[PDB]
Amino acid sequence: GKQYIISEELISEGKWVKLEKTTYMDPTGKTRTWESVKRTTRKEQTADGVAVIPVLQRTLHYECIVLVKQFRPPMGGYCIEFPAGLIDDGETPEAAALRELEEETGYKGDIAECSPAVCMDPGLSNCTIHIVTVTINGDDAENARPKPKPGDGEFVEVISLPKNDLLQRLDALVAEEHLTVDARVYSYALALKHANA
Template sequence: MSLYDAKVTSREPLPEKEAAWTKLVRINYQDPHDKSRTWESAERTTRPKGSDIDGVGIVAILDKPTGPEIILQKQFRPPVEKVTIEVPAGLIDAGETAEECAVRELKEETGYVGVASATSSIMFNDPGFCNTNLRMVHITVDMSLPENQNPKAELEDEEFIEVFHVPLADLFAQCEKFAAEGYAVDARVGTLAEGVELAKKFKL
């Protein structure tokens, strides 16, 4: 059995009282012409009190002699009914900083131990649909450390993740290849790949 054996077996409306992580809301607002309008939105219900973010995305770079490689992972995502190409990510726990969350999630999902080197401002995943947000945390992984020689993920029972890594310089081409093979490419991975290509083109 592998994550490629996963499949959606049915879809049905979800009563609000049964929803564990999300809720739907109707937003009333005034447009620039002072006209009253409404908007339908989804919201997470898991954000810890006092936190300004729902979670983190992780740009984890393996420092290799042959050049930097980015850690990616494959997961089956029921909403799109496909295995997706993603960066490691996770929801923040109460009292955690974004950096602490990123280091913890990277260890749990991939087995790699790293050090946070930079953190983005707050980013919104899909602001036309929901209020979910995150910070992207950059993590450097020292491949000379003993704990990174044979990393083993610490996955929960409901997590099925395949970890791999690709040369950062080849990320755009790899994303194109994955899409052609039928994978869904997460926007964070695709946007990062576009950024790498733009940096090459304009010699930034």
Template structure:
């Protein structure tokens, strides 16, 4: 069984009142010249009232003798009809910090237990289309601990996630290879890979 075994059966319009996770919004605003304009966009319905963010992305790093590796996932995404290469990620629950959500989601999706080192500023995924935002939480994983010897994900019944690791120094090349194989590269993974590549080229 693979994430690639998923198949779209049909696509059809969805009324806003029937949508559980998102809604369409028409915003009216004035531009710097005072002209009134409108903008169509989407909003999530799931952000907790006590949270400034919708979710977290997790930069989970495993230290190995050959160098640090990042934990990635293969997951089918119906909106694009492809298996995406992603970092572990998930929505924040009510009363939960970004860091707590990251540790929980990492354990649920990969089975690994990590320690948070830092978090990014609030970032917006696609601000021209939706208000969805997140923090990228950096987590280190100690493979010598008993809990990480035989990690077992705790996936929901509708989650089909394949976990794998890539050496950080090879992430850009791996993204290029995976795209040629037909995978979609999530922007968070691609941006991280490009940043590493630029740093290597410029010797920063």
């Protein structure tokens, strides 16, 4: 028997996040519940945000993956992640990705590809994002002196690491600093390693 949602009761709602009690039908026709999380900023027929995989390309160097370091309140510490942001109203995933990349890193990129909506943590929330691959011409005079343009309550640090040695460099950051690496960044790094050998 196929499963389906029966009802979604609001438990508590903040200005950005809300908790819900989800009642659904299981394969055996039995009613069960689940505690779900959702963002209050999600628009209809639109993913919550985007994560950007910024590939910095330079003539004299191997490719680099541009990451950002930010203090994350929910984590109680600093985290290393792909640049990311919530999609603004009417804005396409691609546009959101280029804007957030420039805002958080100062780099002006070009779209390479865009994934369909993927889930962030399906066992807990309904949060989804588009993973957008963007290339950056690191030799262009325009990208010589990049500087972020963060908002009021935002201070991002840019950290670019070699694509051919990503996993190792991420491990070093974890060991030497008070940092947590994002699961998507690490999954990306593991496959780069697994593909290689």
